[PDB]
């Protein structure tokens with residue numbers, strides 16, 4: 629039993645809700661919140677900009693030190709950093725950005741990072757400003773993640789479309 633509330637169950641391990649991931653993280657304080665990161669951990673917009681703003685820029689400060697030490701992530705890769713006031717940990721995961729021409733096949737590799745964590749609150753990878761089809765992202769999630777994932781979808785219209793079209 630966990631504290632996630634109001635989710636629709638899609639499969640044995642995948643759950644979905646129309647919610648602002650920032651507000652959901654502040655309420656649940658999950659062990660892991662997933663960020664829709666880029667390789668430079670520059671949290672300017674989309675989910676990343678919203679999560680970072682909610683930390684009063686502490687996420688960005690921590691991320692800049694991470695990059696200065698380690699260099700950029702790989703597309704499809706991830707790193708674990710602090711969750712600040714939102715969660716114990718933040719798993720920064722880089723899905724391919726279609727608006728940069730990145731290989732959509734890397735979306736499966738990106739979701740594989742979730743399997744290193746028993747329970748996660750997450751957005752749909754590569755959705756939103758990353759330019760991929762969210763219906764496809766949900767399919768890859770369900771077919772790749774085996775751990776317990778609670779997906780927050782900000783847009784109500786998109787949420788309804790994802791549920792109604794789910795096979």
Ligand SMILES: CCc1cccc(CSc2ncnc3[nH]cnc23)c1
Pocket residue numbers: 647648649650674675677678679680681682751756780781782783
């Ligand atoms: C600092 C708090 C805050 C600031 C700006 C916007 C938001 C909304 S969260 C959100 N944004 C984008 N895509 C998503 N997919 C699931 N959730 C989301 C919150």
